[PDB]
């Protein structure tokens, strides 16, 4: 059927115009009686419709919450339609959807959304792409009473979000929990991957997390061991 495919930068600097482009497949944007919409969703919140272009002519209806900042257009030949959110702040960080309104036929001016593109999380900050620092997380004394212990490592201060962690090069897949990234106040993210492990296997089995970062070409492998009490060792 119809494909909407959106592109654009996933990072926008403060005050800069946020540009996104949705490409239509299996449908003409020219064809009458459809609306070409733009919707954004903050993390764990309700969608927010912000605007849209009419199909036949360049008619633009805008969410009054944003009319001053948004501008939406349709490319008639290239069969695309774009979005321009001016002067972004941190409150404009969201997953940004392009979608199409068709017309409910039990009514006249009734336009419901029927087709969405997969979505593009774009995050607003001022950082340049930065490799992460990885610090081992381990108990400072062997928790002998509990037959299973927990290890981990802290992935801290890095930019754009694609960071993937694995354990023992991918063999340890059981009990691993890798929490969502969180932009700290600094403008850089921070995760932690953790694994639960039979406590008996501590000193005999070695444990290593494998943190990759594509937009900075950073691969680091950190070993996790019971903490000493001044400095540890290699």
């Amino acid at each position: 059927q119809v494909q909407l495919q959106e592109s654009g930068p996933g990072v926008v600097k403060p005050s800069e115009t946020l540009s996104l482009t949705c490409a239509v497949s299996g449908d003409s944007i020219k064809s009458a009686y459809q609306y070409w919409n733009w919707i954004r969703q903050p993390r764990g919140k309700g969608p927010e419709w912000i605007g849209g272009v009419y199909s036949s002519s360049d008619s633009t209806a805008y969410n009054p919450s944003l009319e001053s900042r948004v501008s939406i257009s349709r490319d008639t030949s290239n069969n695309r339609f774009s979005l321009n959110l001016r002067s972004v702040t941190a409150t404009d960080t969201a997953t940004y959807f392009c979608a199409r309104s068709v017309r409910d036929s039990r009514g006249w001016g009734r336009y419901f959304l029927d087709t969405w593109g997969q979505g593009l999380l774009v995050t607003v900050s001022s950082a340049s792409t930065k490799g992460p620092s990885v610090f081992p997380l381990a108990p400072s004394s062997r928790s002998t009473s509990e037959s299973t212990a927990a290890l981990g490592c802290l992935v801290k201060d890095y930019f754009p979000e694609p960071v993937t962690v694995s354990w023992n090069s991918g063999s340890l897949t059981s009990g691993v929990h890798t929490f969502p990234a969180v932009l700290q106040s600094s403008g850089l993210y921070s995760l932690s991957s953790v694994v639960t492990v039979p406590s008996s296997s501590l000193g005999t089995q070695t444990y290593v997390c494998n943190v990759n970062h594509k937009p900075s070409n950073t691969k680091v492998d950190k070993r996790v061991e019971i903490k000493t009490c001044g400095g540890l060792e290699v």
């Binding site: 039990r106 009514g107 969405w116 610090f135 381990a138 927990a150 929490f179 969502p180 953790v194 639960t196």
Partner: protein, 214 residues
């Protein structure tokens, strides 16, 4: 705006139940209210339009109703791929508004969080700012309070917690409260504790490191 109030913020159902999500407008919107399903990371899929008309291809699980100022999505006989977030949407006109959302989750027993506390490595103390993470492993349901008490009385602020999704296998999940300080203030105190409060355990649990000894 017309302001759409989707009622169950979330809800836990077992496979086979008849969940009832409900959405409510702040004035009459006639029959122009769409219903949407959203898997995470995926594009929302249209489920019902008008107020009861069902999009072609949508299973007949799905039964929308209501008129004017009060609507209802009803999912009887709930399969596993039915588990997602659902959004009502009123398309009277600009500005089109949405529902807050209802996350239909898997209900399975009750588990208590396995609690662990992790002190900072000297690696991290060297950089001037440390992060002490408290871990809540493999528990259900979500609601869990996590105080930090340092070294006798509790610390307010500086603690960003972050939670996973229901684990694919056991449908429990895990929280990660991370306390961050200056290395200078970290060294100025001794006992660091994270006190956890959750339903599946008869009284709060606390894990600590004295660090005036390690």
């Amino acid at each position: 705006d017309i302001q759409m109030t989707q009622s169950p913020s979330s809800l836990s159902a077992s496979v086979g139940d008849t969940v009832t999500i409900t959405c409510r407008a702040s004035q009459s919107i006639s029959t122009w209210l769409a219903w949407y399903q959203q898997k995470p990371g995926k594009a929302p899929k249209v489920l019902i339009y008008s107020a009861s008309i069902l999009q072609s291809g949508v299973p007949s699980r799905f039964r929308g109703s209501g008129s004017g100022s009060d609507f209802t999505l009803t999912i009887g006989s709930l399969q596993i791929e039915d588990f997602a977030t659902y959004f009502c949407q009123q398309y009277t006109g600009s500005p089109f508004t949405f529902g807050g959302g209802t996350k239909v989750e898997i209900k399975r027993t009750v588990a208590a969080p396995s609690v662990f506390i992790f002190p900072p490595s000297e690696d991290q103390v060297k950089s001037g700012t440390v992060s002490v993470v408290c871990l809540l492993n493999n528990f259900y349901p979500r609601e869990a309070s996590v105080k930090w008490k340092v070294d006798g009385a509790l610390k307010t602020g500086n603690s960003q917690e972050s939670v996973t999704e229901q684990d694919s296998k056991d449908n429990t999940y895990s929280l990660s409260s991370t306390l961050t300080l200056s290395s200078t203030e970290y060294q100025s105190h001794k006992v660091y504790a994270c006190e956890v409060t959750h339903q599946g355990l008869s009284s709060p649990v606390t894990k600590s490191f004295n660090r005036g000894e390690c």
